Amino acid sequence: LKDYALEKEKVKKFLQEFYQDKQFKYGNQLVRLAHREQVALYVDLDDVAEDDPELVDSICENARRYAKLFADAVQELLPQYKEREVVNKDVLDVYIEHRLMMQYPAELMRRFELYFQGPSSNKPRVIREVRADSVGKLVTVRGIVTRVSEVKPKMVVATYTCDQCGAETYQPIQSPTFMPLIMCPSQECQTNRSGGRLYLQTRGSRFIKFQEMKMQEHSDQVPVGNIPRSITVLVEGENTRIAQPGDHVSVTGIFLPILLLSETYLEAHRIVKMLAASIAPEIYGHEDVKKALLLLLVGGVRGNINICLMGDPGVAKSQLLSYIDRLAPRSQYTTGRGSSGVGLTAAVLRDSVSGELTLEGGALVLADQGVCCIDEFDKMAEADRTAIHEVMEQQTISIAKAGILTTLNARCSILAAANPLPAALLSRFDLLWLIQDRPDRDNDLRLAQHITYVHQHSRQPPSQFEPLDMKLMRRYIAMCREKQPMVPESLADYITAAYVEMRREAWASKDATYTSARTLLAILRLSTALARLRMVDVVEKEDVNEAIRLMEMSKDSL
Amino acid sequence: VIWGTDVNVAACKENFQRFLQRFIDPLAKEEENVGIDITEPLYMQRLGEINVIGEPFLNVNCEHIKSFDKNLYRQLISYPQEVIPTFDMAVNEIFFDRYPDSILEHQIQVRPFNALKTKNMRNLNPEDIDQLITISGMVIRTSQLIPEMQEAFFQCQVCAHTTRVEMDRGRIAEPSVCGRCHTTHSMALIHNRSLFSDKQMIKLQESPEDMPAGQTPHTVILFAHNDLVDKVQPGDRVNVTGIYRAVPIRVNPRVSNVKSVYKTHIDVIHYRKTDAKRLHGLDEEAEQKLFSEKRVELLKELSRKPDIYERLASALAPSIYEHEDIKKGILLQLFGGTRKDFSHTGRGKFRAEINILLCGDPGTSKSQLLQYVYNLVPRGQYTSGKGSSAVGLTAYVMKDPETRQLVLQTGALVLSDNGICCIDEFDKMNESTRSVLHEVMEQQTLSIAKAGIICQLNARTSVLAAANPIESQWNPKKTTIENIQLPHTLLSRFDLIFLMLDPQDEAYDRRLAHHLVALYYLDMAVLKDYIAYAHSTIMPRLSEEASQALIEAYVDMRKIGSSRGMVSAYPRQLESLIRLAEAHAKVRLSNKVEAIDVEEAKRLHREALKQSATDPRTGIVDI
DNA sequence: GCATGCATGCGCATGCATGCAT
DNA sequence: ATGCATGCATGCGCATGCATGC
């Protein structure tokens, strides 16, 4: 056992004597918190490591008590750093000022939240390995979010007004369900024995945002022959609206039970998210098949792009799709009928909190403003193909069935892989790439040497131009996507001609050709993407020439 | 005022009294200030109009209040519950001061509107509880009327005295002692001698159209009171101004324990129908305040010009090149035909609307036209291929959210009543789904007979359908019927069928390329007013000359279509012609149908199917 | 190319057993 | 001390999706 007063004093002096970062960060944070210019404060346990490390272990063992102690210490320290009144004060601030002008619960007057960030020395755990030994401790978990609930208010402190007196009664809430009061415990009513009845007030009461979310284990950490396990996380305060379904997240929190069996849950404190044509250096050749993927990732200025690759088996189309899925920030990958029907579009499901029905989207909905990858496209069902066509042409999905009447926005770019032409793919897709294989001794020897080098050294063969990591590519793409070039008026007189003659050539080759305004739109989109790659405000001729060359190369694949 | 507020009753009352007399806007134009002298104060004229008519309700714009001052606007937004009665009493005092001897039913009430529009409902916070909020959405469910008690009537068992109690704070305290015989617990409540008010529950579907990445649509619940009940219908797009509420949820009905998490709730105080982009609705068309005399004169002068018809076809969609015939057909559909009544004849309802089918290659702008029509016309619905089921349309069985009321729920087609339904990828639709359309396109009614439910619903809907050839290409060797592959019964119900083909003209390609590249670098209000005035004023009628012309056109059409390979003609087609003629009568603002309208309808029908270029004896089209 | 046989989720009401809040 | 709301099957009615057989 140990007295909490000494540790409270230690926390108070720590919050005031951490200049070793040169600006006094905590002084500024307290000033902003006192002037209502900041509503959240995070404490680093790595910062506490400079002080006595016993506090770190104590916090890791009894996190809630020390969180309350930190909150109390910050509340006591706030008056010292105050300099001025609130510039713009809201309804709650008006109530606080009026109450101070005229005991009150500490959380009622409090208007800030405190959270702990896990130490870097603390190794993250696994959802499967958190058990009774970790109950009440501070843990860090890495996982994937699958379900998120809507934001709703939750009571913190309830305020009651009496029928025959101006006294206000305050009731803290520490349970999922609470019993409202009836009689007035005020001293005036107690003396007079009037027996007045209390009435709840929504304005005086304090509310906080509340959210539910679910997390699952990564497929890498699953043991042999097992199935990933799920955990439930509660979100409150400013941490709300951070996590979204389909994201890989890391959450630091506390493991607590619910009432001799009990059910466990997690309370979140910190949630965090986890030439340039060098896509998949592991694959030899396909030099002209990689710039198209880069342009697809960059996108146009609707400016979406859809790409389909048809090829004989064994040319490794799937690896390119997997690399594209891994590289893109928001991406989804589909293999076939394992995610057909309900896997796409959306479905109606019960709520965890409200107890009513809400709509949860599929792969296409999750991939909104991202890139979707489809493998074995020819094997998909008719309904899925119609939905994909609707997404490609209209960018919205329309659902009208029993209990569902919705229009979902899906602004996603589709990359598809297929085996061996039907007119639908040519008329709908912007770019089709047909990959054919033929035996050549020199090319076979080169490919075999590259494959053997990859298998032996576990790394692609070195060359004059070294490739780049995924983080640098992502940052470069993010920087490139910022700008929006414009097509000059004069170049029209060029581009139109470049179109017309082309169609004339297509009219000469009556065997099998397809041209329309869609080809011109695709050329314009590719030219705009190429101009964006150069950060130029005005599209140049070289971008148009490169786009025309790429389109011709796509067309010349028989 | 209650503790925790800075609102002062007297100051707000004086400020509102001054504002009702001092506010003048010079930027206001006669385009919206109908029947009001702009030089004179506006709200005083509104009060005078109220006195003349007798409507006990006044509409006040929040933007005008903000323009006058910011303190009053902020106080009204923050604390509506205290501000609104002050405004009501100030308005009542001013009205009774200026206009003695007036006769009404109750005191005048004020309804604010056009507050700051929240971009998304999900962006709200508990800080916004009990504040004025404006929403835009579409109604999908409306419940029945619910009575809510306001006063309670009590009667004594022994002496039978009459007493009344008024509700305070939402709770009624029944007396425990009498007033004449002083007997304890001798008072009994009588429900039928009490006073009740109407309450209605409505459901909105939110669509701000600027949703973030991965956000699904939202459903909101609204509660309406008093005269606001039944002011909206399912499928209508409305703006709702009201208050935000939070209500606790009981753990169970018979235990007073409640959950810590509260339930969101919205109270409705104002409805708005007008939109800056969409056409006028049916509610506005039943009023005389829509059009000022100057605009009526301008529209009448414009209608006299001969080219205005074509001008309208030029102004329908400037973002799509040419396609004059398609735009003319869309305009004629928008105008519609005469809605005759055949109840005395026994024939039943007669379809006065036009259904249009467009067939062509996938590389065509038919989808753009469908999207533009859907976005432009109110009460419009959109479906795509197999995404909709036969049960998804019409209605389906669903229980009431509380009890077993067996509440039938409307579908896409029913929500399209008096509107437009667009269908894309009409080929993929199954025969079961087309079975519904078979009845809908002709009878304009839907008959539902399932377990415990037997009913008929109105389905006055006009359909725009899009279709494709077999191989996504128009094969010249195959005939039109072979390429389309649709049953003759289904095709016969379409008034106009537009076949879109590619002639591969160099000038056409150059023009299309120039227009597409230039895309990178008439007034709509005038069009809306003209369409509304034409649709809500004139009922065309046809004469003997039009009769003979229609008979000759019908016999000529039958002779032309007798040949195999082409789409055959049926008597139903004749009716279509009449409808088209009536539409033309609405274009020229003429109450009499002349031979010119019949000739134009015949020309449009002939050009739509490309019969002139089509070989009459082989069914192969070659320009 | 489509209607039907065979699971399966959804929403609901109804009946049998029991465990204790007013 | 007593009557009732709830947990746990089970029938009812329905729609939806996957497979196949003519």
Ligand SMILES: Nc1ncnc2c1ncn2[C@@H]1O[C@H](COP(=O)(O)OP(=O)(O)O)[C@@H](O)[C@H]1O
């Ligand atoms: N050009 C290439 N360079 C290196 N390896 C290749 C190449 N083409 C094929 N491979 C190898 O052959 C295998 C093809 O398998 P897979 O990717 O499933 O083919 P597909 O995607 O065509 O079904 C891959 O594992 C890949 O390592």
Ligand SMILES: [Mg+2]
């Ligand atoms: Mg593969």
Ligand SMILES: [Zn+2]
């Ligand atoms: Zn009291």
Ligand SMILES: [Zn+2]
């Ligand atoms: Zn009595």
